[PDB]
Design an enzyme around this catalytic site. Structure first.
Site, mmCIF file in Angstrom:
data_model
loop_
_atom_site.group_PDB
_atom_site.id
_atom_site.type_symbol
_atom_site.label_atom_id
_atom_site.label_comp_id
_atom_site.label_asym_id
_atom_site.label_seq_id
_atom_site.Cartn_x
_atom_site.Cartn_y
_atom_site.Cartn_z
ATOM 1 N N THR A 16 0.808 -1.210 0.000
ATOM 2 C CA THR A 16 0.000 0.000 0.000
ATOM 3 C C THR A 16 0.845 1.266 0.000
ATOM 4 O O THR A 16 0.292 2.354 -0.196
ATOM 5 C CB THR A 16 -0.942 -0.002 1.208
ATOM 6 O OG1 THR A 16 -0.212 -0.335 2.395
ATOM 7 C CG2 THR A 16 -2.049 -1.020 1.010
ATOM 8 N N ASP A 39 8.485 -10.176 -28.252
ATOM 9 C CA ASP A 39 9.603 -9.255 -28.046
ATOM 10 C C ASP A 39 10.818 -9.700 -28.851
ATOM 11 O O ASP A 39 10.662 -10.274 -29.936
ATOM 12 C CB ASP A 39 9.901 -9.171 -26.543
ATOM 13 C CG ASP A 39 10.451 -7.819 -26.121
ATOM 14 O OD1 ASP A 39 9.737 -7.068 -25.428
ATOM 15 O OD2 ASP A 39 11.612 -7.515 -26.462
ATOM 16 N N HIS A 69 16.392 -7.028 -24.392
ATOM 17 C CA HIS A 69 15.112 -6.432 -24.011
ATOM 18 C C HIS A 69 14.080 -7.497 -23.661
ATOM 19 O O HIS A 69 13.439 -7.427 -22.607
ATOM 20 C CB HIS A 69 14.655 -5.534 -25.165
ATOM 21 C CG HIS A 69 13.407 -4.748 -24.908
ATOM 22 N ND1 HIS A 69 12.156 -5.208 -25.260
ATOM 23 C CD2 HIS A 69 13.223 -3.497 -24.422
ATOM 24 C CE1 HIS A 69 11.252 -4.291 -24.966
ATOM 25 N NE2 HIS A 69 11.874 -3.243 -24.455
ATOM 26 N N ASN A 161 6.926 5.554 -24.608
ATOM 27 C CA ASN A 161 7.917 6.333 -23.868
ATOM 28 C C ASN A 161 8.098 7.735 -24.445
ATOM 29 O O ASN A 161 9.201 8.290 -24.426
ATOM 30 C CB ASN A 161 9.254 5.589 -23.839
ATOM 31 C CG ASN A 161 9.119 4.166 -23.320
ATOM 32 O OD1 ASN A 161 8.360 3.913 -22.386
ATOM 33 N ND2 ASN A 161 9.853 3.232 -23.923
ATOM 34 N N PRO A 175 -8.515 0.050 -27.397
ATOM 35 C CA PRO A 175 -9.230 0.144 -26.114
ATOM 36 C C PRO A 175 -9.385 -1.175 -25.380
ATOM 37 O O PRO A 175 -9.427 -1.173 -24.144
ATOM 38 C CB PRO A 175 -10.596 0.737 -26.498
ATOM 39 C CG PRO A 175 -10.354 1.425 -27.804
ATOM 40 C CD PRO A 175 -9.318 0.593 -28.512
ATOM 41 N N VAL A 177 -7.506 -3.837 -24.903
ATOM 42 C CA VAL A 177 -6.368 -4.458 -24.227
ATOM 43 C C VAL A 177 -5.982 -3.608 -23.023
ATOM 44 O O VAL A 177 -6.584 -2.557 -22.769
ATOM 45 C CB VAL A 177 -5.185 -4.682 -25.191
ATOM 46 C CG1 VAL A 177 -5.629 -5.588 -26.350
ATOM 47 C CG2 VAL A 177 -4.609 -3.365 -25.693
ATOM 48 N N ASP A 200 -4.936 2.101 -18.859
ATOM 49 C CA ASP A 200 -5.756 1.390 -17.892
ATOM 50 C C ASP A 200 -5.123 1.331 -16.513
ATOM 51 O O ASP A 200 -5.856 1.218 -15.523
ATOM 52 C CB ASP A 200 -6.010 -0.043 -18.365
ATOM 53 C CG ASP A 200 -6.786 -0.089 -19.651
ATOM 54 O OD1 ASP A 200 -8.002 0.189 -19.619
ATOM 55 O OD2 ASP A 200 -6.175 -0.373 -20.700
ATOM 56 N N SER A 224 8.119 -0.484 -21.250
ATOM 57 C CA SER A 224 8.398 -1.891 -21.512
ATOM 58 C C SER A 224 8.625 -2.667 -20.223
ATOM 59 O O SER A 224 8.446 -3.891 -20.198
ATOM 60 C CB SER A 224 9.668 -2.038 -22.353
ATOM 61 O OG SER A 224 9.437 -1.721 -23.707
ATOM 62 N N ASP A 260 -2.333 7.452 -5.663
ATOM 63 C CA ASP A 260 -1.026 7.500 -5.032
ATOM 64 C C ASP A 260 0.051 8.124 -5.909
ATOM 65 O O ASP A 260 1.138 8.431 -5.407
ATOM 66 C CB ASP A 260 -0.537 6.083 -4.719
ATOM 67 C CG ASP A 260 -1.243 5.454 -3.546
ATOM 68 O OD1 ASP A 260 -2.067 6.122 -2.887
ATOM 69 O OD2 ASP A 260 -0.949 4.269 -3.282
#
Length: 279
Positions: A16, A39, A69, A161, A175, A177, A200, A224, A260
């Site tokens: 938390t 990837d 990566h 990024n 939208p 995913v 999301d 990523s 937060d």
């Protein structure tokens, strides 16, 4: 279960509050789930994967990760030390070359591959796909991501990024995913993270330690890196029976730490992925 001296992002996912360093999670640990990492590949021989990783498809001369990566992202999903879901099965799909680049037609083929290939795998607790990649807006790329999701795979994609609205990038802008932004260890929006209504959820993305090629480890930053936190979290929650591939993104948002994060633009969700595990 408790993992002491864990990477900050793992500790963050089960807390938390920021500023702790132990990761707490149910010992089931994603057993019986599967995560595809679409990837640059995965160095499956890395001791950190414990035989639970394998390459299942490549579009290039090798299935090896010659970049790092994909191995880093796969490590955040499911490596023993750096992973969220420490007992999931990892499947590598190499749609990106060893420079980290790939044609959209190959990326689309890889997504449709996963939608079918899951029927060749044993994933009784469910299937996730982690897509730490993207470029400019493409309806065809978004549609491929939508199909993969529709087929019964929890699709998690990087927001990008560009420190810009993710509506102009794909597959981030699809939208249906789960579009993942990045935060840092002080609960600030990562300086590079895209934002916007299409996001999301946020996950840890600045200074993320994970596996690398050559049997090594390193810390790097990006959306990523946030995406596989969410993909691994989905696999973990599916193994627990708490959600399904079709509903996991919404469930993660429902159960996220709320309000937060700092520097979240007006109109972007202030939601940080959280496993709500009570030891």
């Amino acid at each position: 279960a408790a993992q002491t001296n864990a990477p900050w992002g793992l500790a963050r996912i089960s807390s938390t509050s920021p500023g702790t360093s132990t990761y707490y999670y149910d010992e089931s640990a994603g057993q019986g789930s599967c995560v595809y990492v679409i990837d640059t590949g995965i160095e499956a021989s890395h001791p950190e994967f414990e035989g639970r990783a394998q390459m299942v498809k490549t579009y290039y001369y090798s299935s090896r990760d010659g970049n790092g990566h994909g191995t880093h992202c796969a490590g955040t999903v499911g490596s023993r030390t750096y992973g969220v879901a420490k007992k999931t099965q990892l499947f590598g799909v190499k749609v990106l070359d060893d420079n980290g680049s790939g044609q959209y037609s190959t990326i689309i083929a890889g997504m449709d591959f996963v939608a079918s290939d899951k029927n060749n795998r044993n994933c009784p607790k469910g299937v996730v796909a982690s897509l730490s990649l993207g470029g400019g807006y493409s309806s065809s790329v978004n549609s491929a991501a939508a199909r993969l999701q529709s087929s019964g795979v929890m699709v998690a994609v990087a927001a990008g990024n560009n420190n810009a609205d993710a509506r102009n990038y794909s597959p981030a802008s699809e939208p249906s995913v789960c579009t993942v932004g990045a935060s840092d260890r002080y609960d600030r929006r990562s300086s590079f993270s895209n934002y916007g209504s299409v996001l999301d959820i946020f996950g840890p993305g600045t200074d993320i330690l994970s596996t690398w090629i050559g049997g090594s480890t390193r810390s790097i930053s990006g959306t990523s890196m946030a995406t596989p936190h969410v993909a691994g979290l989905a696999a973990y929650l599916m193994t627990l029976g708490k959600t399904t591939a079709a509903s996991a993104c919404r469930y993660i948002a429902d159960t996220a730490n709320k309000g937060d994060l700092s520097n979240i633009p007006f109109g972007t969700v202030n939601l940080l992925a959280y496993n709500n595990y009570q030891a």
